[PDB]
């Protein structure tokens, strides 16, 4: 699109892109929450 907006994930050493929020949002929320499954 015109604007695609990478979303650049802000994590230390992995900094993942993705195309939505979406994939952003469940990727920074098991970084954040390392607590999760423990």
């Known amino acids: 699109m015109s604007d ?3 979303f650049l994930c802000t994590a230390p050493g992995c ?3 993705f195309t939505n929020e979406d994939h952003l949002a469940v990727h920074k929320h098991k970084h954040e929450m ?3 499954f423990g």
Do not use: A
Request: net charge positive; glycine share 12%.
């Open 15 to 17: 900094g993942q892109r």
């Open 34 to 36: 390392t607590l999760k």
């Open 4 to 6: 695609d907006k990478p």
